């Protein structure tokens, strides 16, 4: 109740609409604060669109390494790795990182149109379990959080999930599940975000989104000093299309649920 109350004020205090649920592996417990409302996941899709390619590799042992053109008419909104390598390649690996590190647009469409676009990411999702979430657009279109618009959006429990799943399930092979958590403990972009609300000491795994309607996102897998595994999914969505980022909300939440 204490936690509810917090995440409540929280929520009230931000102005927005907050979701989030942690798994505590530990006890296998959950806290859910709007946990099976409907989010825009923004980049937070990068972890399916990654693992989905993952999943591929396990019976195409050199997809990896396969090399993509990266050309001018590549290029979205938001493209720090890739613009620097216009008219050149980038493999599969390369852009996974790109896409899961930096938020990079181009190599996000890049792991979506591998696989066979949006609708078969979310297949692979519904293969999984995970009933919930859909990837409907490419970059740059997916961002758009309209309020009460289901496309490209999941659940905060369905997340957690399926994230838990991911990172310490079997949902992939040994090596393909240790790359995806390799890649997601380099995330660049986080560090403001859940890793905000959380002692300097623990180790974090995540992949932050963000969006129109001042959308701030981030879903984690974090190891506590001494203690099992966390999931932690934070989503969170503001009345005003063009209201500011609140990465503080995310960290807050993150105190909120681990204190
Ligand atoms: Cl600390």
Not at 39 to 48: D, G, I, R
Not at 85 to 92: D, F, I, P, Y
Not at 154 to 183: E, H, I
Request: one cysteine or more; proline letters at 5%; glycine letters at 6%.
């Amino acid at each position: 109740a204490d936690v509810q109350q917090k995440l409540a004020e929280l929520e009230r205090q931000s102005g927005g609409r907050l979701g989030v649920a942690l798994i505590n592996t530990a006890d296998n417990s959950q806290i859910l604060y709007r946990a099976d409302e409907r989010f825009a996941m923004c980049s937070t899709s990068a972890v399916m669109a990654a693992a989905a390619v993952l999943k591929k590799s396990e019976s195409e042992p050199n997809l990896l390494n396969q090399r993509v053109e990266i050309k001018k008419s590549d290029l979205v909104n938001y493209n720090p790795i890739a613009e620097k390598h216009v008219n050149g390649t980038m493999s599969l690996a390369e852009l996974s990182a790109a896409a899961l590190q930096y938020s990079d647009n181009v190599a996000m469409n890049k792991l979506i149109a591998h696989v066979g676009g949006p609708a078969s990411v979310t297949a692979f999702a519904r293969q999984l379990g995970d009933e919930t979430f859909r990837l409907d657009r490419t970059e740059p279109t997916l961002n758009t959080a309209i309020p009460g618009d289901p496309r490209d959006t999941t659940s905060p429990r369905a997340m957690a999930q399926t994230l838990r799943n991911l990172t310490l399930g079997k949902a992939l092979g040994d090596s393909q599940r240790a790359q995806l958590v390799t890649w997601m403990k380099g995330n660049t972009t986080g560090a403001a975000s859940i890793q905000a609300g959380l002692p300097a000491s623990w180790v974090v795994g995540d992949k932050t989104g963000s969006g129109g309607y001042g959308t701030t996102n981030d879903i984690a897998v974090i190891w506590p000093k001494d203690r099992a595994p966390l999931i932690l999914v934070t989503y969170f969505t503001q009345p005003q299309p063009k209201a500011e980022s609140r990465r503080d909300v995310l960290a807050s939440a993150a105190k909120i649920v681990t204190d």
